[PDB]
Amino acid sequence: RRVNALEQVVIPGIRAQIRFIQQVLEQREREDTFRLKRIKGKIEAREAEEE
């Protein structure tokens, strides 16, 4: 009974939680990359204000 309970219940929930956390972290990293791109664009635009 314990073997069946663990195998059919306990593991898939942990796996789903792991899969959710990975997606959240990846999304945050992608947003950080976008912000870094914008600040680099502003930095390059600053130098051309008066050559």
């Binding site: 997606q23 990846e26 999304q27 992608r30 976008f34 791109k37």
Partner: peptide, 9 residues
Amino acid sequence: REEIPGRRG
């Protein structure tokens, strides 16, 4: 075209 992405890119 360097746009703000959504839920999974």
